[PDB]
Design a protein around this ligand. Structure first.
Ligand code: ZN
Ligand code: ZN
Ligand code: ZN
Ligand code: ZN
Lengths: 147, 23
């Protein structure tokens, strides 16, 4: 499953960076470019909705690094009106990164892997053919392209 | 109720982001 493998790579890499604060050195043409986009736009949505995300995290009441089931239902609920766009998708990933950060403060040795798998699952399973229709992450990259 | 509120703020922010970049 290339699309799943690729989406998880991007999403884990971003969440790990945000949580620990360090980049990783390690097929990545659109991937490196998608992560570049995510870093720029992700930080964008986090910066201006800081109070809202904090509000959402308290409400979410995350216990540990494996307690992702409530975040999963939230993501299903976002999409349940039948509207799909990269704005929503980037906001969810950006929120996961916010959650990852606070998980590293209440431990500092948590795999962010469950969080990333959880986000990638909802995305790729429930929006599979949608993502394929626009060449996966090139769609994401092009939508957030600034000149 | 809690999950509904979180979903709705993520949706609002996401749609706002969408609208911006779809200029
Ligand atoms: Zn680990
Ligand atoms: Zn260009
Ligand atoms: Zn609802
Ligand atoms: Zn806003």
């Amino acid at each position: 499953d290339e699309l799943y493998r690729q989406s998880l790579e991007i999403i884990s890499r971003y969440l790990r960076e945000q949580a620990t604060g360090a980049k990783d050195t390690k097929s990545g043409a659109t991937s490196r470019k998608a992560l570049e986009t995510l870093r720029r736009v992700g930080d964008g949505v986090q910066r201006n909705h800081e109070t809202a995300f904090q509000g959402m995290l308290r409400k979410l009441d995350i216990k540990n690094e494996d307690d992702v089931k409530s975040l999963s239902r939230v993501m299903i609920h976002v999409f349940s009106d039948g509207v799909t766009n990269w704005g929503r998708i980037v906001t969810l990933i950006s929120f996961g990164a916010f959650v990852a950060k606070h998980l590293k403060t209440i431990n500092q040795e948590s795999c962010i892997e469950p969080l990333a798998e959880s986000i990638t699952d909802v995305l790729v399973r429930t929006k599979r053919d949608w993502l394929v229709k626009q060449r996966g992450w090139d769609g994401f990259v092009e939508f957030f392209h600034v000149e | 109720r809690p999950e509904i509120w979180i979903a709705q703020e993520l949706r609002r922010i996401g749609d706002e982001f969408n609208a911006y970049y779809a200029r």
